Every structure is written in structure tokens, then in C-alpha cells.
Amino acid sequence: KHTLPDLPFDYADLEPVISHEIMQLHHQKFHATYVNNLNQIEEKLHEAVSKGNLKEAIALQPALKFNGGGHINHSIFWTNLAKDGGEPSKELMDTIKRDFGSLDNLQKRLSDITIAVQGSGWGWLGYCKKDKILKIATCANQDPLEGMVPLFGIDVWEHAYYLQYKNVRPDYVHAIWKIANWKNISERFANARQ
Template identity: 55%
Template sequence: MFSLTRNLARPAFSRALAQRSASLHTLPALPYAYDALEPHISGQIMELHHTKHHQTYVNGLNAAEEAYAKSASTKEQIKLQSALKFNGGGHINHSLFWENLAPTSAGGGQLPDGVLKTALERDFGSVDAFKKKFNTVTAAVQGSGWGWLGYNDTTKKLEIVTTANQDPLISHVPIIGVDIWEHAFYLQYKNVKPDYLNAIWNVINFKEAEKRLAEATK
């Protein structure tokens, strides 16, 4: 079977694809209500994003994998690579994204003292400096894509990177990922991406991010 990304064996990606039965990918349930992230992300956006956009990637991935399994030649399998990458990346990225968010009532937006805060201060100077740089780099994405805080296995540092479209992050271990596709914010923030990026820090699940960092640095 086509390998979605070399990082699938890592814990964060394993959780991202945990909702499986046989070879069928399914839409993961959110660990909070659609309106739980308001006023920072509207319930309408969350419901559409989850049930329409993410579901479309799941459907597309299942269809592409089925076609790949039935392919009669290598040529046919090669033709399916882009569909597998796009829909597989969309499924992985969104599964990680939902876990990256948490209502303020459940600790969203709160970064306690610990290994993540220490690493951010070491690699960016301060938490505020990290957020400012992340927002600047991510807002500069042309068209659709993702902004990531990733852990670099080689440098042993946290770094800010972006990926285009639904490309999964394979150069780093994903710690925090933010969807910058218009479907993630346009209904609420229109074309003002910086407002969306400023607001999302109020509902970032730093506990999950710290867990991913701990797993990456074992």
C-alpha cells in the first residue's frame, strides 16, 4: 500500500490515523462541541470544516486506496499518487489539527511552565516572539497551506515551517499545525488572515503540543 508519509509510524501520526476499520479510513470525532471554541472560531466554521471538508478528504483517500489496490499496472498506481498524497495529507493534517485545539474552559491557550515553554524560549527568545514569527511566516503562505511548529531531529530545535495545499509535514515532527486554507477562517475573518492567526492562540492545545514534543525527544 502507498505510504502516506515516512512519519506515520510516529505516535502523533499514529493517533491521526487511529480511526480505522480494516483498510477504511473514517472521520475522527472531535473531542469538543463545534461551538466550544467560540468566539475565537465559530461553531459554523468548525461544523463545516469537520463534516464537509475533512470528510471529503476521508472519502477521497478511501477511493484512491481502493483504486490503488485494484490497479492492474504500475502505471495506473503512479497516476494515483497525487490523489493519495492530497487526500491522505488532508486526512492526516486535519486529524492533527483538531487535537491542536481546545476550548478555553479546558485549558486552550494556556501554556504552563514545562519542556515546551522552555524550548520555545530557547529557540525563539520568548513565547511572544515565537507567536509573532509563526503568524508572520504562516500569513505569508500564498494560496492554501499550513503553518507548522515542527521539531527538527537533526538540529534538535523547534522550527517554523509551512507546507502547501494538503502536503503533510515530513521534514519535521509536527508539534503545532494551523490550517491556513480559507475554509478554516473565511466565514468569520473574511480575508484578514492575521486576525484569524492572532485569535487561534486562544484555543491552541498546548498540552497536546507538549506531549508531541516529549514523544519526539525521547
């Protein structure tokens, strides 16, 4: 039902920022496994909720969140990366300046909170429709970003960088900005503002 999306580029297209092997494992092993497990979990949850099997439905929650979140997060991440992703739209850049001062400031602040994640997780730039502002946040494990529309995510599970950067998470978080797909991020921003 839920399916593994093809990448919008080939496995080596993000070198030298992220290696072919990192991408191939990340897509073919991690994302594929989140999808396969999600489909199994979702079927079980459908059954449990329909039947009012309440203990079971509650028991399935951590697995739905983890595999479902895995699918949500990685699907967004692939669209967020490009060999040549361009620059923010004028509208996005103007809003970055409003809410963070400059793109430089945003990159520093998001990189810092992302680097600081204890264990596995994600950093996010998002847009909050209620307060009409850009925000930055982190999520543990595969918890999906909630409370704001996701625009740009940075995966800091060790599987996202270890083969190439080894322990040096900061160099990966800083380098990923080189392959940020600003065309996609800008499109997500435009959609979030409607």
C-alpha cells in the same frame, strides 16, 4: 478503513475565535470528504502497486497526497485546539526560549510565515529529531509536514476562516493562539523527544 475522528469538543466550543458553522463544515464536509476520497484512492493504489501497474500508481499520487494529507493535517488540527488548552509544559517553554528566544517571538515568526502563504496551505511548528531543534515551516494545499514531527498546525485555507474573518487572515492567525491546545502540543513534543 481510515475514519473521521470525532472532535474532542462540541462545534461551538471555540467561539468567539472560530464559529460553530466554520467548525461544522470543516469537520463534516471537508475532513469527511478527504477521508471518503482517501479510502477510495488508497484501495486503487493498493491494486495498482500490487500488480505493478506503474503508470496508474504514479497517476494516483497527487490524489493520495491531497486527500491523505487532508486527513493527516485535519486530524492533528482538531487535537491542537481547545476552549481552555492551558500553557506550554516547562520542557516545551524552555525549548521555545532556546530556539526562538521567547514564546512571543515564536508566535510572531510562525504567524508571519503562515499569513504569507500564497493560496491555500498550513503553517507548522514542528520538532526536528535529527538536529534536535524546534522549527517552523509552511506547506502548500494539503501536503503533510515532512522532515520534522508536527506539533501545532494552523490551517489557512480560506474555508478555515472566511465565514467569520472574511479576507482578514492575519486576525484569524493571531487569534488562534488563544485556543492553542498546549496540553496536546506539549504531549506531542514529549513524544517527539523519545
